[PDB]
Design a protein around this ligand. Structure first.
Ligand code: HEM
Length: 82
């Protein structure tokens, strides 16, 4: 609906990744070096990951996070979590 990546992140992601952390599996934060060690480097990598993520994270399909919104989330993640 034209929401920005940060707003989408606050709604859908920050309940388990507040400030880019991880409240479920603490080592698995969004910090750049950590996520990139598991292959999550680009905007598109983030957008694809949320469709089929690791255990303990729900999948986010296109009905709840449309493709354009998934890319905006990816942009936010890459920009915000060094
Ligand atoms: C919201 C859409 C959202 C995003 C974006 C997101 C991202 C994300 C990444 C990039 C990782 C790192 C994976 C890696 O292997 O390094 C990651 C990992 C986990 N997440 Fe997440 N996440 C989003 C949402 C949520 C929500 C709402 C939860 C909690 C219910 C959650 C949880 C987790 C867990 C657990 C992991 C670790 C998975 C693993 O392989 O061990 N995420 N997330």
């Amino acid at each position: 609906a034209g929401a920005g990546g940060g707003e989408l992140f606050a709604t859908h992601c920050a309940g388990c990744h507040p400030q880019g952390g991880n409240t479920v599996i603490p080592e698995k934060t969004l910090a750049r070096a950590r996520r990139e060690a598991n292959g999550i480097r680009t905007v598109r990598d983030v957008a694809a990951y949320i469709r089929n993520p690791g255990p303990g994270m729900p999948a986010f399909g296109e009905a709840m996070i449309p493709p354009a919104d998934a890319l905006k989330i990816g942009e936010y993640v890459v920009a915000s979590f060094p």
